Write a protein that holds these residues in place. Structure first.
Motif, PDB file in Angstrom:
ATOM      1  N   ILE A  38       0.873  -1.154   0.000  1.00 14.53           N
ATOM      2  CA  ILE A  38       0.000   0.000   0.000  1.00 14.53           C
ATOM      3  C   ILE A  38       0.903   1.193   0.000  1.00 14.53           C
ATOM      4  O   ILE A  38       2.106   1.059   0.179  1.00 14.53           O
ATOM      5  CB  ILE A  38      -0.991   0.062   1.239  1.00 14.53           C
ATOM      6  N   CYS A  39       0.318   2.359  -0.219  1.00 12.83           N
ATOM      7  CA  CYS A  39       1.068   3.604  -0.145  1.00 12.83           C
ATOM      8  C   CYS A  39       0.405   4.453   0.939  1.00 12.83           C
ATOM      9  O   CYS A  39      -0.735   4.162   1.381  1.00 12.83           O
ATOM     10  CB  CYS A  39       1.062   4.320  -1.509  1.00 12.83           C
ATOM     11  N   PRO A  40       1.121   5.471   1.421  1.00  9.71           N
ATOM     12  CA  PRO A  40       0.574   6.354   2.468  1.00  9.71           C
ATOM     13  C   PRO A  40      -0.794   6.980   2.104  1.00  9.71           C
ATOM     14  O   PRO A  40      -1.662   7.077   2.954  1.00  9.71           O
ATOM     15  CB  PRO A  40       1.642   7.461   2.597  1.00  9.71           C
ATOM     16  N   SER A  41      -0.999   7.377   0.854  1.00  9.98           N
ATOM     17  CA  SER A  41      -2.308   7.915   0.478  1.00  9.98           C
ATOM     18  C   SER A  41      -3.459   6.910   0.632  1.00  9.98           C
ATOM     19  O   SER A  41      -4.576   7.330   0.874  1.00  9.98           O
ATOM     20  CB  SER A  41      -2.302   8.600  -0.912  1.00  9.98           C
ATOM     21  N   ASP A  42      -3.199   5.607   0.506  1.00  7.83           N
ATOM     22  CA  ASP A  42      -4.237   4.590   0.730  1.00  7.83           C
ATOM     23  C   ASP A  42      -4.727   4.665   2.193  1.00  7.83           C
ATOM     24  O   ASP A  42      -5.924   4.553   2.457  1.00  7.83           O
ATOM     25  CB  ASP A  42      -3.693   3.162   0.511  1.00  7.83           C
ATOM     26  N   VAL A  43      -3.790   4.796   3.137  1.00 10.09           N
ATOM     27  CA  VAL A  43      -4.104   4.985   4.558  1.00 10.09           C
ATOM     28  C   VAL A  43      -4.833   6.325   4.787  1.00 10.09           C
ATOM     29  O   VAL A  43      -5.890   6.361   5.390  1.00 10.09           O
ATOM     30  CB  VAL A  43      -2.793   4.922   5.438  1.00 10.09           C
ATOM     31  N   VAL A  74      -8.777   6.782   6.273  1.00 11.46           N
ATOM     32  CA  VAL A  74      -9.180   7.508   7.495  1.00 11.46           C
ATOM     33  C   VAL A  74      -9.881   8.853   7.254  1.00 11.46           C
ATOM     34  O   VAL A  74     -10.717   9.226   8.042  1.00 11.46           O
ATOM     35  CB  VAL A  74      -8.036   7.678   8.544  1.00 11.46           C
ATOM     36  N   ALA A  75      -9.551   9.560   6.164  1.00 16.03           N
ATOM     37  CA  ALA A  75     -10.032  10.916   5.923  1.00 16.03           C
ATOM     38  C   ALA A  75     -10.261  11.170   4.421  1.00 16.03           C
ATOM     39  O   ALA A  75      -9.605  12.017   3.810  1.00 16.03           O
ATOM     40  CB  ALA A  75      -9.043  11.953   6.525  1.00 16.03           C
ATOM     41  N   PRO A  76     -11.212  10.450   3.834  1.00 13.15           N
ATOM     42  CA  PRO A  76     -11.464  10.414   2.395  1.00 13.15           C
ATOM     43  C   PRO A  76     -11.705  11.819   1.803  1.00 13.15           C
ATOM     44  O   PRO A  76     -11.269  12.130   0.688  1.00 13.15           O
ATOM     45  CB  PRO A  76     -12.712   9.529   2.287  1.00 13.15           C
ATOM     46  N   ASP A  77     -12.341  12.655   2.599  1.00  9.12           N
ATOM     47  CA  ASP A  77     -12.735  13.974   2.211  1.00  9.12           C
ATOM     48  C   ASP A  77     -11.565  14.952   2.350  1.00  9.12           C
ATOM     49  O   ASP A  77     -11.675  16.102   1.893  1.00  9.12           O
ATOM     50  CB  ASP A  77     -13.858  14.440   3.147  1.00  9.12           C
ATOM     51  N   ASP A  78     -10.474  14.553   3.011  1.00  7.19           N
ATOM     52  CA  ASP A  78      -9.354  15.486   3.205  1.00  7.19           C
ATOM     53  C   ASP A  78      -8.157  14.752   3.785  1.00  7.19           C
ATOM     54  O   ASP A  78      -7.856  14.832   4.989  1.00  7.19           O
ATOM     55  CB  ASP A  78      -9.769  16.653   4.105  1.00  7.19           C
ATOM     56  N   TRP A  79      -7.454  14.058   2.899  1.00  3.89           N
ATOM     57  CA  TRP A  79      -6.409  13.122   3.293  1.00  3.89           C
ATOM     58  C   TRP A  79      -4.972  13.691   3.269  1.00  3.89           C
ATOM     59  O   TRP A  79      -4.088  13.133   3.930  1.00  3.89           O
ATOM     60  CB  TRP A  79      -6.537  11.839   2.443  1.00  3.89           C
ATOM     61  N   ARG A  80      -4.730  14.772   2.521  1.00  3.84           N
ATOM     62  CA  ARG A  80      -3.349  15.278   2.341  1.00  3.84           C
ATOM     63  C   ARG A  80      -2.699  15.667   3.672  1.00  3.84           C
ATOM     64  O   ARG A  80      -1.506  15.434   3.864  1.00  3.84           O
ATOM     65  CB  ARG A  80      -3.228  16.450   1.324  1.00  3.84           C
ATOM     66  N   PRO A  81      -3.477  16.273   4.592  1.00  5.12           N
ATOM     67  CA  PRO A  81      -2.855  16.588   5.869  1.00  5.12           C
ATOM     68  C   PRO A  81      -2.408  15.364   6.692  1.00  5.12           C
ATOM     69  O   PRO A  81      -1.612  15.496   7.632  1.00  5.12           O
ATOM     70  CB  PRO A  81      -3.942  17.369   6.587  1.00  5.12           C
ATOM     71  N   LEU A  82      -2.903  14.193   6.363  1.00  3.57           N
ATOM     72  CA  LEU A  82      -2.469  12.976   7.071  1.00  3.57           C
ATOM     73  C   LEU A  82      -1.189  12.324   6.545  1.00  3.57           C
ATOM     74  O   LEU A  82      -0.752  11.347   7.105  1.00  3.57           O
ATOM     75  CB  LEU A  82      -3.605  11.948   7.142  1.00  3.57           C
TER      76      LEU A  82
END
Length: 85
Positions: free
Chosen positions: A25-30, A34-42
């Motif tokens: 998997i890649c970090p964006s999959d995680v 967890v935060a489909p609507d706003d994932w970049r900050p994670l």
């Protein structure tokens, strides 16, 4: 702030657990899970989580085929279960 360390760790395990042996998997999959609507900050929190699970020997992080520390590595990385005999 919005996701705990534990939550991110459990999400890495959950996503890896659902995939084939030797898949990754890649970090964006995680972050998206967890935060489909706003994932970049994670993105950095997810790297820290992967780093903790790597330190524990549960997963390995790779970049261009080589095992790396996700906390140090620049750009796209992969996360996989450790499969050492």
């Amino acid at each position: 702030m919005t996701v705990s360390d534990r939550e991110l760790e459990e999400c890495i395990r959950a996503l890896l657990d659902a995939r084939a042996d030797s898949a990754s998997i890649c970090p964006s999959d995680v972050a998206r899970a967890v935060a489909p609507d706003d994932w970049r900050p994670l993105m950095e929190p997810v790297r820290e989580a992967a780093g903790r699970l790597a330190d524990a020997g549960e997963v390995e992080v790779t970049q261009k085929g080589a095992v790396v520390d996700p906390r140090s590595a620049r750009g796209p990385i992969r996360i996989r279960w450790t499969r050492t005999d």
